[PDB]
Structures are given as structure tokens and as C-alpha cells.
């Protein structure tokens, strides 16, 4: 609530910043169905 | 997915218990407003 205008969002320190490249985006499968996930760290993460 | 019906939900070990009694609810004051938190330490916690 109280969204000031003279302030401007800064980006908490303890986030990893990832460049959005299109090699980050594969394919996993579970239950016989192929679904879209993220490569951030090597280990396929849902998009959730 | 794959919505089993043999597979019964447990609730992971590493995660607090709380019984829920109607003392865990306060509220706290914030750009001259109320709003409804938790006090699961006497800590005023947010909803999300």
C-alpha cells in the first residue's frame, strides 16, 4: 500500500540476476507429457 | 500432475506447527491504515 511516486524500486540485494537468453528455455517430461521449463542453475525448475 | 488416488499427502517434516487459536490474529497500523496479521512469534506477520 502507499505507493509513493519520488521512490523508485531497487532491487533487493539477495536476487540472482539472470540474462534472459533463449537457452535457458527446455523441455521436461513427468506422467508422459512434455511440459516447459527453466535452465538457471542446470536443474530443470518448473515455472512455479 | 499425475493426480494419484493411492498417493496420500504428508505434510514434510521441516515445516512449524501451528494451532490455529483466534489469540495468533492482530493487527498492525501502516500509512494510517489497518490491517490483519499473524503472531506466530509475537511478530506481526503478513499474510503473504
Redesign the interface.
Known sequence: ??FDVYETLTIPTDVKTIVLTMQHISTQT??N?VYYVFLIDGVKILAE
Open positions: 500500500a502507499k513427468q506422467n507429457m
